[PDB]
Symmetry: C2
């Protein structure tokens, strides 16, 4: 005996019928919870991306020089690259994760419509025949019961009331044939309906088991996709960080200081103190600052 919905969702009152149908709302509930969860997770990522992009738009002054200035620019460009990545990730979190639940809820609605329709008609007919069977069985039952009574009256009745009784008895006996006939027809019709019901519910159970099995594969894959997206985000950001470090590694402080000196130098000549100007040896005061070239060791 196989372990499937086909063999384990029956019951004397179609318990499996009402159960598996009502489960559709539980599946929908679970699906909506996760959609809502990942909806927020995506917006969190988007906001993060947006703020990081805004930060990348920061303008610095022109006060820094050399490769150190370049490093700040590279760093800002790479923070921007991280923003772009996170924005792309948030978009995928919405489209491939969040919206996957949305597309599932839309698909499930159609699946339920197709399944519920093609089984509730069969079920309604099953109950319809069964009602007709009980109604027919009852008529035939209490007709036989009246015959029993009318015969028992023959022992104590007399006169015109005995013949009136025997008239009722005779009329009731002739009703038995048709009543028994309609009853047996009701038995036959209910048998066929049950036979059709057994086959149809089996078919429905197979389809309902498919949905459940696909549901669990779906939920696993989406959560899997979620981790793939975040791991990708980590790879991207780490690569950006590595590029910042590579740029920093190539940034020589001593070379920067050299270039700083060349660009900011104010003079290599040391001003000499003013000398004595003897009025008599033709000497005359001048303003030309004598310069002696600096020649110190660091």
């Amino acid at each position: 005996m196989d372990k499937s919905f086909s063999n384990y969702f029956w019951g004397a009152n179609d318990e499996g019928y009402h159960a598996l149908l009502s489960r559709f709302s539980d599946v929908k509930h679970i699906n909506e919870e996760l959609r809502s969860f990942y909806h927020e997770r995506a917006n969190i990522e988007e906001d993060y991306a947006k703020r990081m992009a805004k930060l990348s738009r920061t303008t610095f002054s022109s006060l820094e020089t050399g490769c150190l200035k370049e490093s700040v620019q590279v760093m800002k460009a790479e923070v921007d690259n991280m923003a772009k990545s996170h924005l792309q990730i948030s978009q995928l979190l919405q489209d491939d994760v969040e919206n996957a639940f949305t597309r599932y809820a839309a698909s499930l609605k159609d699946k339920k419509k197709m399944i519920v329709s093609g089984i509730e008609k069969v079920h309604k007919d099953k109950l319809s025949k069964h009602q007709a069977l009980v109604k027919a069985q009852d008529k035939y039952h209490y007709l036989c019961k009246k015959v029993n009574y009318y015969v028992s009256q023959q022992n104590m009745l007399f006169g015109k009331e005995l013949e009136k009784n025997n008239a009722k008895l005779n009329k009731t006996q002739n009703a038995i044939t048709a009543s028994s006939s309609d009853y047996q027809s009701a038995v036959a019709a209910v048998r066929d309906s049950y036979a059709r019901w057994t086959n149809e519910w089996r078919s429905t159970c197979d389809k309902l088991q498919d949905i459940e099995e696909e549901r669990r594969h779906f939920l696993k894959s989406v959560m899997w996709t979620f981790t793939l997206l975040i791991s990708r985000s980590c790879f991207n950001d780490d690569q950006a960080c590595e590029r910042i470090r590579k740029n920093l590694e190539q940034c020589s402080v001593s070379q920067d200081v050299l270039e700083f000196i060349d660009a900011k130098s104010t003079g290599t000549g040391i001003p000499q103190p003013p000398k004595f100007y003897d009025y008599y040896k033709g000497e005359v005061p001048d303003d030309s600052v004598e310069l002696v070239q600096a020649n110190f060791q660091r």
Copy 2:
């Protein structure tokens, strides 16, 4: 000739003196710009973490079953772990990156007060001696021009006008010898002051260059730290994703469905159709629902 601050920041008007001193203001503004940048970056990270922790506090319904139910909890728990990680990272960004500039700013301020202390006095003495020189220089040549006036008017003059003239000539000629010595004394003093200034400014230059070198090593170090922190964040999140994937790998859909069937089964008995009970001969309904156990294949 070494390429150092000590050899390249002179100039006839002490341009290098004023340039390297106002340099402190630029260095401070660069540091503040970066501090502000990483403050926002740390802030973005903190908001990210806080919002992600709030999300992981979501409560899901207990409608889900099996390993899948466990996987959803593992997923949400690892989302929680990522939030905690991003929170600590934001704290380290604040204390080790952002606050690094704050610690540097304090040390730079106290360092500046010492450089400015030991050089501004020396510079004023240079300017003070120079003012004393130009004043003595002017007095000397003004007297020389005046002795020259009375001399050129000698032969042109006569008697009592000559005597009045020559009297002012003697008084002036006398003063010239004295002012010439004061002029020379000033020249001697100024050359001493310029010598001290030269030796002191080169010393200060060497210190200022140490500061500039220190500064560039510092900013690179803090940027480096920034990348290590983000990379560490990437690592933690990726590990969290791995752990989620380890759990999904071990979760079996088949087993979940098998356990679902076991828990939710509503019966294995197929209800059989009601039979015809010949009431007319005393055949009484056995109101039992005959159950033929299902044996369908999947």
